[PDB]
């Protein structure tokens, strides 16, 4: 495995290299938007982002080592957390707003129904990233941790448990990478452990937001007013 053989710096460079692009919405300021169409813009965007995410996942060290079955599982479990952390990252420099796309910067006001609660949580998370002064190197590490961690305890016999051990070893590598980054930033050892904890604890809140969002997506689907892509419906379905 090349994955387990990478150095901290190599892991950082690999993850930075694999970063997907920032996409544009179809948003037109002159064009009127209801609650539906506004959600149609977001679901259209998410759908396109998912294709890029899928291809990004392939470039995360260790991911391709797993069976197709396991790759499917992790992505089905992590997809919304991953979209959400990227959104929160992009929005860091826009207090009170969420940058879904360079041309689509929304605030809580444009929360129209049940989306306002989720907007509020995302904004709160962005505020936290800002409070901590989250770094890009730290962000890519966190995002890969989400992909690998979120579905790893919800996966057979004694074999197919070696699948899990490999994931845990990659995860440990990413922890080492985080510590290396903080050390280089001149953090004291006590400060390094404290910050690592602060970063990993954010993952708990991302999981929470993803589950609340998944509920909201299911209700939007049942109201049948907001168009959902086929890929989005399948990922949503995987959460039952």
């Amino acid at each position: 495995s090349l994955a387990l053989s990478l150095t901290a710096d190599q892991m950082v460079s690999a993850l930075l290299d694999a970063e997907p692009p920032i996409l544009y919405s179809e948003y037109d300021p002159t064009r009127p938007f209801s609650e539906a169409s506004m959600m149609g813009l977001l679901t259209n965007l998410a759908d396109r982002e998912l294709v890029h995410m899928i291809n990004w996942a392939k470039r995360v060290p260790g991911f391709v080592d797993l069976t197709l079955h396991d790759q499917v599982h992790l992505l089905e479990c992590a997809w919304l957390e991953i979209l959400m952390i990227g959104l929160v990252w992009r929005s860091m420099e826009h207090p009170g707003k969420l940058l879904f796309a360079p041309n689509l910067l929304l605030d809580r006001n444009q929360g129209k129904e049940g989306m306002v609660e989720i907007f509020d949580m995302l904004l709160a998370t962005s505020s936290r990233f800002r409070m901590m002064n989250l770094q890009g190197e730290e962000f890519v590490c966190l995002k890969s941790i989400i992909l690998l961690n979120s579905g790893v305890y919800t996966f057979s016999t004694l074999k197919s448990l070696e699948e899990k051990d490999h994931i845990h070893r990659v995860l440990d590598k990413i922890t080492d990478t985080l510590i290396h980054l903080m050390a280089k930033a001149g953090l004291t050892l006590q400060q390094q452990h404290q910050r690592l904890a602060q970063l990993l604890l954010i993952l708990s809140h991302i999981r929470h937001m993803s589950n609340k969002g998944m509920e909201h997506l299911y209700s939007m689907k049942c109201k049948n007013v907001v168009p959902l892509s086929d890929l989005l419906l399948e990922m949503l379905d995987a959460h039952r």
Binding site: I54, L68, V72, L75
Partner: peptide, 9 residues
């Protein structure tokens, strides 16, 4: 399934 397909393509 779509995801399955995209992971292979």
């Amino acid at each position: 399934k779509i995801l399955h397909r995209l992971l292979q393509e």
